[PDB]
Symmetry: C3
């Protein structure tokens, strides 16, 4: 069903958005610690954390694109 499939994808998007919100909270906390106590080791960890955060954004966009296709098929 078009309606059921769209809601399923929107629920996946909701879960991805919440995962992103949690990751943003962690990233902002280590950013404040980086500003207080900078070092090469801290920067490397911070860069790695940014990349993980970007990967969550990419998944969020992938789901958005899937919802758009389902909508276009429904209309």
């Amino acid at each position: 069903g078009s309606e059921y499939e769209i809601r399923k994808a929107l629920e996946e998007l909701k879960a991805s958005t919440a995962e992103l919100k949690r990751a943003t909270a962690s990233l902002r906390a280590i950013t404040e610690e980086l500003k207080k106590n900078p070092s090469e080791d801290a920067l490397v960890e911070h860069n790695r954390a940014i990349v993980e955060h970007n990967a969550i954004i990419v998944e969020n966009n992938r789901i958005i694109a899937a919802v758009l296709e389902l909508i276009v098929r429904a209309i």
Copy 2:
């Protein structure tokens, strides 16, 4: 009204997109300065700027998700 609400959310998305465009312009400028004059202090500031930019993307995605829900209710 479904039509009015969707347009309101799209106007919020338009404003978020413009905020992101301005932030990208700033971020690219400090990236060119980082490449010219690297240092730990410059890297820490740059990492902090990336995180702020990512936070704007996250807000843009949040608005997109809200528009998708309004569309699904309208169809």
Copy 3:
């Protein structure tokens, strides 16, 4: 045509998503190399790569916003 225009924009989104997938693959590879062999020179290159990746996300979001407007006009 509303249908043709939406499909054209979704094809542009598909191409942008694939560009992002390729960039993510590169970014993850240099992140693993950063963790193995950190240095200031490696960090500067990594920061520059993050910014390029973020610019692809921004373009993906721009296309998404354009698809949303076309959908709203079609419904």
